[PDB]
């Protein structure tokens, strides 16, 4: 089997991407943020504290003839910015772009933090990291991909995120028309439960490539590109007026600037992020100071190849016995 679903930016800045997911019988379609950095499929629901729902579409398990309460199971998760959610668990039929998994754990939110409430466009998350990170207790549950894998034509999924445009998540096949040149595969460590890999270096604009190992994770659930302070300083030094602002919380730059590209290495291959991809717009409405799309990972404890990087590539998440990651230009 295969599946193919369009993923759409939630706003004009590509702050995140949402993908329609069918849950239950009859289908209830929710727009979920596919997150290769986490391993829980959770949704706003009829069980979510009423005051914490503000425009999201909810899953109502009582209206699904295939929903079954997973007895005694609960979940609770906290993300990189301290946002959080928790609740109970059902199993139900879940379909993505024509690919169907029966008995998928659907984690129904009883509580969500303010950041989730305040974002009406995201109805929940669909985790695509390794199932070892799933938070369901006392019996850990499998991700959608892990459940589907055996049925897939090939044990892979691909992320093809758009710049200011929709893109595609495919399951079970590689669309050879969706990229240019070849796909370069690179080793993955699953020790921390992430799609963790090592970039071979970087360049800023038309500058010389610096060969240096940068360990990081491919995280579609993170908007920006977080890299070591040395690398980030070298990038922003090429932008007149750019500065790291403690008050704003990172590098900002004059909105009048034309940004240089940023290149990262995948083995001997090179992925070029155009400068425009690195502009996240005014820091506050009407400001002429803009927020940068490349930020320091210092104090995070890990580098993050988030959407800013991933959207410049066609990315293969290879879930074979020994997982690997593939990157192609597009
Ligand atoms: C939960 C856990 C399993 C630990 N996985 C993680 O926390 C993973 C994996 C790594 C863990 C160690 C630290 C680095 C990454 C962070 N990621 C965070 C990853 O799972 C999570 C998914 C998510 C999506 C939507 C809304 C909330 C949360 N993204 C995040 O925590 C980051 C935080 C940030 N500001 O960088 N969220 C965003 O980049 C983000 C999401 C939505 C937005 C909407 C509008 C405007 C900006 C937006 N920014």
Q: Which domains does the chain have, with CATH numbers?
A: 5-174 (2.40.70.10), 175-330 (2.40.70.10)
35 assigned to active site: yes
- For residues 144 and 4, give the distance between their C-alpha atoms in angstroms, rounded to a whole number: 14
The rounded Å distance from CA 151 to ligand 1 centre is 29
Q: How many residues does the chain have?
A: 330
Which technique? X-ray
Contacts of 16 (CB under 8 A, 6+ apart): 9, 10, 33, 121, 122, 221, 223, 307
Choose which residue among 12, 18, 38 to substitute to test ligand 1 binding: the one with the highest number of ligand atoms within 8 A of its C-beta: 38
Handedness of CA 25, 27, 33, 35 (dihedral sign): positive
What are the tokens at 77? Answer: 């998760």
Burial class (CB in 10 A: 0-12, 13-18, 19+), 177: exposed
What are the tokens at 3? Answer: 């599946």
199 assigned to active site: yes
Q: What share of the chain is helix, strand, coil (3-state, %, to 5)?
A: 10, 45, 45
The rounded Å distance from CA 275 to ligand 1 centre is 23
What are the tokens at 148? Answer: 């589907």
Q: Whose CA is nearest to atom 46 of ligand 1?
A: 15
CA distances from 263 to 5, 156, 204, 236, 275 (A): 28, 25, 6, 14, 10
Ligand 1 atom nearest to 39, measured from its CA: 3
SS3 call for 3? strand
- CA-nearest of 21, 13, 16 to 119 is 16
């Amino acid at each position: 089997s295969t599946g193919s679903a369009t993923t759409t930016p939630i706003d004009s800045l590509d702050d995140a991407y949402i993908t329609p997911v069918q849950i239950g019988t009859p289908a209830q379609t929710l727009n979920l943020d596919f997150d290769t950095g986490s391993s829980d499929l959770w949704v706003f629901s009829s069980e979510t504290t009423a005051s914490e729902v503000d425009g999201q579409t909810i899953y109502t398990p009582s209206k699904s003839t295939t929903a079954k309460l997973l007895s005694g199971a609960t979940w609770s998760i906290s993300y990189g910015d301290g946002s959080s959610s928790s609740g109970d668990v059902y199993t139900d039929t879940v379909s993505v772009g024509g690919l169907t998994v029966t008995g998928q754990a659907v984690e129904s939110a009883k509580k969500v933090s303010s950041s989730f409430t305040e974002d009406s466009t995201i109805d929940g998350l669909l985790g695509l990291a390794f199932s070892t990170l799933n938070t369901v207790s006392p019996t850990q549950q499998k991700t959608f991909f892990d459940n589907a894998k055996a049925s897939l034509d090939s044990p892979v999924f691909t992320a093809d995120l758009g710049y200011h445009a929709p893109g595609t998540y495919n399951f079970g096949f590689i669309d050879t028309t969706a990229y240019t040149g070849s796909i370069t595969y690179t080793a993955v460590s699953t020790k921390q439960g992430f799609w963790e890999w090592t970039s071979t270096g970087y360049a800023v604009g038309s500058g010389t490539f610096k060969s240096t190992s940068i360990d990081g994770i491919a995280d579609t659930g993170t908007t920006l590109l977080y890299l070591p302070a040395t690398v980030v300083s070298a990038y922003w030094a090429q932008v007149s007026g750019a500065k790291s602002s403690s008050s704003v919380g990172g590098y900002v730059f004059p909105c009048s600037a034309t940004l240089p590209s940023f290149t990262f290495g995948v083995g001997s291959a090179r992925i070029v992020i155009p400068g425009d991809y690195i502009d996240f717009g005014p820091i506050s409405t009407g400001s002429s100071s803009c927020f940068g799309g490349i930020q320091s990972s210092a104090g995070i404890g890990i580098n993050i190849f988030g959407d800013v990087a991933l959207k410049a590539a066609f990315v293969v998440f290879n879930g074979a016995t020994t997982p690997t990651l593939g990157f192609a230009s597009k």
